[PDB]
Amino acid sequence: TFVALYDYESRTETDLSFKKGERLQILNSSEGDWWLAHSLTTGQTGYIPSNYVAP
Amino acid sequence: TFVALYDYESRTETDLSFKKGERLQILNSSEGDWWLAHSLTTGQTGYIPSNYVAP
């Protein structure tokens, strides 16, 4: 359980909007936390599921 | 620097598609890692930027 420090306005159909002070429960999914990444193969950039990669 | 263990097909305009074996560089943004969360105030669910919340 976490609490929002700031308002956040959703920018896509997959993010969650919330107001400062909302209580949030973090859920476990197969994909893990998501990270912003850059592909050294294609030059493309965006978020990736962390459980799909390894150092 | 990380390496993909699996193919991933992008599902939105913000994620990054990649093939098994691609090399990926993780980038630092203000928002932090993104987590799947559930709002105890609105019942809504989706990803949130982790730097916006606190326990």
Side-chain angles (χ1 to χ4, degrees), chain A residues 1-8 10-12 14-18 20-22 24-27 29-55, chain B residues 1-8 10-12 14-18 20-22 24-27 29-55:
Chain A
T1 296
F2 291 72
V3 56
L5 305 174
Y6 311 90
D7 303 339
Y8 176 72
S10 60
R11 311 185 291 222
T12 73
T14 47
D15 46 358
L16 167 68
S17 294
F18 55 80
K20 183 168 172 279
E22 287 201 20
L24 307 166
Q25 165 180 129
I26 302 313
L27 308 164
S29 81
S30 64
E31 311 155 321
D33 292 2
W34 289 69
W35 303 340
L36 192 58
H38 179 61
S39 170
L40 294 177
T41 303
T42 65
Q44 295 175 15
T45 307
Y47 295 94
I48 66 179
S50 63
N51 280 353
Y52 275 61
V53 309
Chain B
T1 296
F2 291 72
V3 56
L5 305 174
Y6 311 90
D7 303 339
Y8 176 72
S10 60
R11 311 185 291 222
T12 73
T14 47
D15 46 358
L16 167 68
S17 294
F18 55 80
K20 183 168 172 279
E22 287 201 20
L24 307 166
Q25 165 180 129
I26 302 313
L27 308 164
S29 81
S30 64
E31 311 155 321
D33 292 2
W34 289 69
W35 303 340
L36 192 58
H38 179 61
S39 170
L40 294 177
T41 303
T42 65
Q44 295 175 15
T45 307
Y47 295 94
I48 66 179
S50 63
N51 280 353
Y52 275 61
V53 309

